Amino acid sequence: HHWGYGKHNGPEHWHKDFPIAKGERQSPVDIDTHTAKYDPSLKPLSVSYDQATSLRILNNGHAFNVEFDDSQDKAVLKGGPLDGTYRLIQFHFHWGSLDGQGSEHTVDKKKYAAELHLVHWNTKYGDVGKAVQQPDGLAVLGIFLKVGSAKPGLQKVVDVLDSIKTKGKSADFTNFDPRGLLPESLDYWTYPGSLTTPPLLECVTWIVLKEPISVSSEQVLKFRKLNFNGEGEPEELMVDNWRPAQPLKNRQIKASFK
Numbered sequence: 001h002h003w004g005y006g007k008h009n010g011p012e013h014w015h016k017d018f019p020i021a022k023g024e025r026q027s028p029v030d031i032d033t034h035t036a037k038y039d040p041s042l043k044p045l046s047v048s049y050d051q052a053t054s055l056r057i058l059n060n061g062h063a064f065n066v067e068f069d070d071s072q073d074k075a076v077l078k079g080g081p082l083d084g085t086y087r088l089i090q091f092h093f094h095w096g097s098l099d100g101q102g103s104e105h106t107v108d109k110k111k112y113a114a115e116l117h118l119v120h121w122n123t124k125y126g127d128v129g130k131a132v133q134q135p136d137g138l139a140v141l142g143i144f145l146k147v148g149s150a151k152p153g154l155q156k157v158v159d160v161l162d163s164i165k166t167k168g169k170s171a172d173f174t175n176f177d178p179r180g181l182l183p184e185s186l187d188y189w190t191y192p193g194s195l196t197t198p199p200l201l202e203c204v205t206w207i208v209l210k211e212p213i214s215v216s217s218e219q220v221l222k223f224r225k226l227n228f229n230g231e232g233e234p235e236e237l238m239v240d241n242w243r244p245a246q247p248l249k250n251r252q253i254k255a256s257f258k
């Protein structure tokens with residue numbers, strides 16, 4: 001009665017309502033490190049998050065989004081394979097019920113515990129609504145999470161999850177610094193793709209970081225305690241909200257490093 005990740009409304013069914021699901025530039029994809037083309041013309045990424053203004057965190061029934069004020073060029077992404085300035089609008093995660101799965105993208109078929117997506121829209125389009133209608137409208141920075149040591153910068157997010165346990169719940173979330181979620185290196189792979197959830201619009205330039213960040217078992221456990229359902233409805237734990245790898249088709253994955 002609406003898409004989800006369940007047996008009856010999961011990824012295998014999305015194509016019925018969103019035919020683009022079987023499109024030419026769908027995400028995520030498997031990154032085969034041996035076939036990725038090192039491209040020397042790729043410029044380094046420019047991540048300027050020092051003026052980032054987070055405002056709210058909400059459980060939307062599919063994942064939890066941390067939203068940022070994108071009214072001005074406060075937190076932007078430029079450089080890399082990008083042409084123009086991209087403003088950060090929100091970030092969310094995809095994760096699994098077990099540590100051996102959770103990521104959307106895979107590297108040489110290897111799945112990580114989770115995947116962080118920092119969503120940005122191209123400023124030349126005026127608003128996000130217009131950007132999703134363009135081939136280069138969005139830029140998503142993907143970061144893999146592996147279970148190991150705790151990530152201090154992630155704890156503030158972890159602590160607030162209790163207040164947004166169910167669908168539709170939101171909590172004020174100001175003064176969060178997204179710089180605390182970045183790995184040391186900004187080396188990346190890039191390819192043209194799409195949103196990984198319906199409407200599955202093919203308007204995204206994907207930039208997937210090579211270096212994952214570590215999070216503790218305890219930190220990822222808290223993600224698994226969220227609910228897909230709203231208050232008063234049957235409880236369904238929010239886990240495995242990831243889409244399986246899609247055919248690469250006529251696309252080439254470029255790498256910024258040798």
Ligand SMILES: NS(=O)(=O)c1ccc(C(=O)NCc2cc(F)c(F)c(F)c2)cc1
Pocket residue numbers: 055067068069070071089090119120121128129132138
């Ligand atoms: N400036 S703000 O904090 O008041 C604000 C925050 C989030 C959104 C939003 O998520 N729209 C949906 C949405 C988000 C995306 F990231 C997209 F790519 C998209 F197409 C639609 C809009 C405004």
Ligand SMILES: NS(=O)(=O)c1ccc(C(=O)NCc2cc(F)c(F)c(F)c2)cc1
Pocket residue numbers: 117119132140194195196197198199201
């Ligand atoms: N996991 S990910 O990075 O690929 C991803 C990022 C953002 C969104 C999103 O904003 N959906 C809202 C939304 C509502 C609409 F009505 C739209 F038209 C639209 F494009 C997006 C979905 C997936």
Ligand SMILES: [Hg+2]
Pocket residue numbers: 131132133134135136137201202203
């Ligand atoms: Hg598009």
Ligand SMILES: [Zn+2]
Pocket residue numbers: 092093094117196
């Ligand atoms: Zn995502």
